[PDB]
Amino acid sequence: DSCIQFTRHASDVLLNLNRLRSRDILTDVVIVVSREQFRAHKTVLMACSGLFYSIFTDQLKCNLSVINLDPEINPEGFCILLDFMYTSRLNLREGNIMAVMATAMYLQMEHVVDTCRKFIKASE
Amino acid sequence: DSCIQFTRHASDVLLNLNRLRSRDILTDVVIVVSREQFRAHKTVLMACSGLFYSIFTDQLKCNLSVINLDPEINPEGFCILLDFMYTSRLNLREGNIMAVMATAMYLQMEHVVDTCRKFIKASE
């Protein structure tokens, strides 16, 4: 086509989706990770994660308002990844890298798994 | 903070939101523009448009599944803008620029109004 493109559009959309999440506006699911609860938008979760894409395209699970993750999933690791989904920013640290990588593997977030593997290989 | 950022993340999220829209997955509103209907995600509309941000933060309108636009709104102009919301790409042409600008003004999409004004000024 003969379209023009607005460079910052995708980033501005994501910034606004994060603002809606922070104000709990039109959030439609709560992700339970052991004792912790995280409110989010199903569409954003599906757009970032192979696991959520599978869950919310399921004819029964698409209608659930609560999703319980595997008890081995670390809430801080999930929180870091949920923040990444809504911002493109990953708070990767020596103290959390193992939890972040394990959570990214479970959530099926290949690019995160890739940078975690690379950061781990550099430290050995 | 000491975060790392994934450059393509925002663009990949938007590409997936558009794929969900094309397959009518978790769309939660239909925008009626005279004889035409457009299914979309309320969160994406709010993230792109001052008018939809106002409508869906309203305590009554947030729960509506159908929104009827002003009868002066051109469906093709709306379609071009809805595509822009989900892709960052604006199909701006001599034959549609007036309709696109009028629709962008109504929808409160300042960056689109700005490029339409600039393209119009260059042709006079």
């Binding site: 379209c3 493109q5 460079t7 | 790409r89 960056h111 490029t115």
Partner: peptide
């Protein structure tokens, strides 16, 4: 705005 750019030509993509």
């Amino acid at each position: 705005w750019v030509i993509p």
